[PDB]
């Protein structure tokens, strides 16, 4: 029936994985959201005229076993790799998440988008050029976002969906 896209949001703690997901799905900016809570968010949306279901796992990197987490990593179709533009360490951590995803999929051709979040903040330490060079090295799109203002939020997730469409054929 209706097309479903299974997405997974990964990245270092505090980059805005939860805020991005909640902004996309519920259209508000959360002030605080327990950093250990991992949950799935679903919504029917229209992307490029195609009505579909998004099924998004907001990961929290906890050690406790979750059969749902395993199912999303195994069957997840695309991944958002998120850092914050005011958090150099979170950008350095990106490679770890990409390498993990490649192992889960046993492939270097996994639908993926690099997300530089918190672009509303002036305290930038990761230049747009640094992130563009990383994305080019991976061969993936790079999108700057603000979960606070909504800038780039739909584009980040929808671009990932478009990458999944490519990978299917
Ligand atoms: N200024 C700003 N703050 C953000 C943005 N996204 C998230 N935050 C804040 O950063 C903190 C961590 O966000 P959160 O979604 O919990 O990060 P997570 O650990 O990756 O899930 C929270 O206090 C959010 O309100 C953003 O785009 N801009
Ligand atoms: Mg979170
Ligand atoms: Mg919206
Ligand atoms: Mg520098």
Residue numbers in the entry: 0 to 168
Excerpt from the paper describing this PDB structure:
RAS proteins are binary molecular switches that cycle between active guanosine triphosphate (GTP)-bound and inactive guanosine diphosphate (GDP)-bound states. In the active state, RAS proteins interact with a variety of effector proteins, such as RAF kinase, PI3K, and RalGDS, leading to activation of downstream signaling pathways. The role of magnesium as an essential cofactor for small GTPases is well established as it is required for both high-affinity nucleotide binding and GTP hydrolysis. To examine the effect of N-terminal modification on the tertiary structure of KRAS, we carried out structural studies on KRAS constructs containing iMet (unprocessed N-terminus), lacking the iMet (partially processed N-terminus), and KRAS lacking the iMet and with N-acetylation of the second amino acid (fully processed N-terminus).
